[PDB]
Structures are given as structure tokens and as C-alpha cells.
Amino acid sequence: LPIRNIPGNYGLPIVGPIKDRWDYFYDQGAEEFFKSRIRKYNSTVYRVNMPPGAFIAENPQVVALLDGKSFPVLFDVDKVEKKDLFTGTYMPSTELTGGYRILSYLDPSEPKHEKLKNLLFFLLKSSRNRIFPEFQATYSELFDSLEKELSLKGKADFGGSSDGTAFNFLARAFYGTNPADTKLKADAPGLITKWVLFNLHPLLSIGLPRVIEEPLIHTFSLPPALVKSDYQRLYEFFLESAGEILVEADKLGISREEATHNLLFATCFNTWGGMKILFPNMVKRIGRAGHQVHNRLAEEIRSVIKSNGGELTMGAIEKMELTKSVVYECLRFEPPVTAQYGRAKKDLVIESHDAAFKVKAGEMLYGYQPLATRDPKIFDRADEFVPERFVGEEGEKLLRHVLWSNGPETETPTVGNKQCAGKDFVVLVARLFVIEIFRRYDSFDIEVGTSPLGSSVNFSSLRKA
Ligand code: HEM
Ligand SMILES: CCCCC[C@H](O)/C=C/C=C\CCCCCCCC(=O)O
């Protein structure tokens, strides 16, 4: 491939980044922000300013990678450093996390990265026999509540009930603890939501006019002191509930305090927060796929469970070809977390589809994942949600290009890489979610709106089996 100069520029000091921020948040939105520049520069690799800039991030300047050939450089731990860039060009204060640099911020060259990721592998493995029954019990209560709400109001707000459900499910599945039996009661979602806001506010819009939003959430960090007592309630819950896991933390050579802050973060931020984005998104996309798809899913799921003597098991799920494919297609079409960063460790040559680009050691690389996973040079019908895309031997090959986990779907997270520690768990619970829907309902209708993180979704009809 021909070597091309990386196009784009960062504009003037101060005002360049501000104008780009306004495009990103207000005047274009993320997807068009990136696509308009791909068109202007005739390139899927270019220089751009990223939020937050201002007084939050020292340096907004990145090289953006917006196709599925160049993007995977971001997984290569021999090419990029992954230290303190979980959230991009700024890092939330460690005051927000008990004074520790939590696992998600650690480069694999740091010894505690290996220890803490092993702790999480253990948490997940040791929960294996509680996941199915607790998911089935907690999500059954959710759909009960949504039917109730639909009957009263003519619509049922998914997110406002499902957030409680997700935390209850995680407390019961991971820690054998029902939050209702603790001092947290039903408060966890509100507590976690406020704390996540204090971490992520520089990257989000809450729909307020820019004249209010810009000085309030886009210019300076929100003070960690204001969420410390809320965080303390969560900390004490984990300290008191995570006993069996903390025994393993002890064997792995992790202090009780460090392990507890990490368990808090993995459960509340990575898992519950990731589920808060994914599940409403899935409901939106599957809803849009229409009633014929719903009926095919119902028929497959119910038939397979019946073939399995009414017992839902991991083996039964392997038989549900459309269900598996629909979950992967949700993850491809709409990656729940769109922003991955890495800093070049050395001089690199990054290949795209039609040219190669040289980057210098120290340059911040950035990828907007949806442009890599809807790359029309890799996927046919790239902008179409195709339920059956991954069905069959040939369909399954394309999974190497599904990147939601910060690595190919065909790869495994390890202590040596920065791929999502909960990769298998996420795919499993997404499957169980679809199963629980279509074992109960033939089809459904939805109303949809925007949310700071993912999607706001109401059910307007739930057609019972
Ligand atoms: C739908 C839910 C989830 C989504 C969308 C998601 C997504 C991601 C993504 C995109 C990253 C890469 C971060 C980066 O840019 O470096 C990541 C990393 C990570 N995730 Fe997940 N995740 C989810 C659930 C979970 C679960 C269940 C766990 C349980 C352990 C988990 C633990 C982690 C950890 C520890 C990392 C950092 C990995 C490392 O340092 O090597 N996540 N996740
Ligand atoms: C509330 C968000 C929880 C997602 C946790 C998941 O494990 C990984 C997150 C990885 C990067 C941190 C930044 C997350 C910002 C999400 C909103 C904007 C976007 O999609 O990039």
C-alpha cells in the first residue's frame, strides 16, 4: 500500500478543540462528526480533537482509526500502551475509587493487572452455577413489573425498572446476596448512577442546552467529595457481601481493601453500567427487527427448551442459532462502548484499506468502534441489522470482526491483554435476556428515545405466549 500523510488538523489553540467539541456533542453528534470528516479527508484515518479538552484533559489531539483493518492495532499490547486511558485523554480522580488505580486503568506490564484480572476470572467462574437460576428469577420479576406498568399506563419504561433488576441479579449471582436484605435496600442504582456521572460527565451530554452543559459538565471535573458518602455505602456492601471472593483475593496476594474497590468497580461500573447500555439497545434493535423475527426467535427458543426437557442449560443455548446470531448482531451493529484508546509505544505503520500511515511513538490512537464494525469493506449489508448474519459456518467466521470486548470475538481475554474480563459472561447474559423475552412473549412493540449513555425504551405491547 502507498504511504499517505495522515490528513486532518487540530485548528487553533483553545478554539479548535472547542469547535470540534460542539460538533461532537451538539451540531453533528458522534457518528456524523466522524463520517463527515471521513468524507472531507477521503480517509478512515485522520487527525482530530476529542472531548473533553478544556481543563479536564491535557491534550485532546488523537489519530482516529475508523475502519476494521486499522482499528485492531488498538488491541496489540506490543504496539500500544494501555495505561490510564480507559476513559480516553483524561482519567477520573483516584479519589473516586478509594485512592487506587483500578484494574481497568492498568497496563498489562503492571503486576497487579495480572492479579486483579485473575480475581475477576475467579469471581465469574465461581458464579457459574448461580447465573441461570438467579437471572431467571430476577428477570421474571422484571417482566411481571413491566406487564403491571403496561396495564396501568399503556406503556412500560424499561430502563427505570431494569436497572434495579440488573443490580439485584449481580448481587445474587456473584455474591449470593439479595440487596433487599442489606442496608443498600433498593438504593444501588441511584448511588451507582451518580458515581458513574462523576466519572464520565466530560464525555456525555444530558440534553441540557450547551450554554448550561458546557460550563457545568464539559469544562471542569465535578468534585469527588460530593459522591464520597454514596460510594461508601457501596463499599460497605461489597466489603460485607464479598466474603468468599475476598478469600481468593487473599490467596492471589491482593489486599482486602484493594480487592474490595476493584470488585465494586467491576460489578458497578464495568458490569452493571455495561448492562445498562446494552440491554435497552438490544430491546430497541430486536424490536425494530419486526414481528416475523420475534416469532422465529420464539419458535426456536421454545422448541429448543422443549427438546431439552424444559431445562435451560449452556448446551441448549448452543442449539439456538438465530438467538446466538441476533446477540452477536446487536454487539456488531451497536457496540455498547464506542471509544477505545491506545498510545503508540514505538513508531508504527498502520495499514488501512487503501493506504498505510506512519505514527510516531507517543501519539494517542483512538478508534470509534461502530465504524470498524459497520465497515462495508468487511461486512455486506453493513448498515443493516441482519438477525441471521452469524448463522452457519461462514457466518461464524465473521465473528473475528465483532469487537465489542476490545478484541476479536473469536479471541479470549487473558492476563496478557486488555480484552474485557467478562467477555463470556456478557455474551451469556445477553443470550439469557433474549431467551427470557421470547419464552414469555410472541412479539412486542417499543417506543424509543435518547439517553445520556445508550437508549431509553418503553414497551407499548407485550404479546404473551
Ligand atoms: C455489557 C457489559 C460490558 C461491556 C459493554 C463491556 C465492555 C468493555 C470494554 C469496551 C472494555 C475495554 C476498555 C478499554 O478501552 O481498555 C472492557 C474492559 C474490561 N472489562 Fe468489560 N464490559 C462489560 C462487562 C464486564 C463484566 C461482566 C466484567 C466482569 C469482570 C467486566 C470487566 C472488565 C475489566 C476488568 C476490563 C479491563 C480489562 C483489563 O484491564 O485487562 N466487563 N469492557
Ligand atoms: C457506564 C459505562 C459502563 C461501561 C463499562 C465497560 O466495561 C467499559 C467502558 C470502557 C470505557 C469507559 C468509557 C465508557 C463511556 C461510555 C459512553 C460513551 C462511549 O460509548 O464511549
UniProtKB/Swiss-Prot annotation:
A Pfam match: p450
Q: A GO term (biological process) for this protein?
A: oxylipin biosynthetic process
Pathway the protein takes part in: Lipid metabolism; oxylipin biosynthesis
Q: Which domain of life is it from?
A: Eukaryota
Which terms in the Gene Ontology molecular function aspect does this entry carry? allene oxide synthase activity; heme binding; iron ion binding; monooxygenase activity; oxidoreductase activity, acting on paired donors, with incorporation or reduction of molecular oxygen; oxygen binding
What happens upon changing residue 104 to A?
Confers strong HPL activity
What induces this protein's gene, according to its Swiss-Prot or TrEMBL record? By wounding.
SUPFAM superfamilies per the record?
Cytochrome P450
Where does it reside?
A: Plastid, Chloroplast, Plastoglobule
Q: Which InterPro entries match?
A: Cyt_P450, Cyt_P450_sf
Residues annotated as binding (13S)-hydroperoxy-(9Z,11E,15Z)-octadecatrienoate? 270, 338
Q: What CDD domains does the database record attribute to this sequence?
A: CYP74
Record's Gene3D superfamilies? Cytochrome P450 (1.10.630.10)
Sorted keywords for this record are: Chloroplast, Fatty acid biosynthesis, Fatty acid metabolism, Heme, Iron, Lipid biosynthesis, Lipid metabolism, Lyase, Metal-binding, Oxylipin biosynthesis, Plastid, Transit peptide
Q: Which residues bind (13S)-hydroperoxy-(9Z,11E)-octadecadienoate?
A: 270, 338
A GO cellular component annotation here is: chloroplast
**What's the Enzyme Commission number for this chain?**
4.2.1.92
Q: Which residues bind heme b?
A: 82, 113, 117, 418, 420
Per the similarity annotation, which family is this?
Belongs to the cytochrome P450 family.
What function does the entry list?
A: Cytochrome P450 enzyme involved in the biosynthesis of oxylipin jasmonates, important phytohormones acting as growth regulators and signaling molecules for plant defense. Functions as an allene oxide synthase that converts hydroperoxy fatty acids to unstable allene epoxides. Catalyzes the dehydration of 13-HPOTE ((13S)-hydroperoxy-(9Z,11E,15Z)-octadecatrienoate), as well as 13-HPODE ((13S)-hydroperoxy-(9Z,11E)-octadecadienoate).
What is the protein's name according to its record? Allene oxide synthase, chloroplastic
Species name for this entry? Arabidopsis thaliana (Mouse-ear cress)
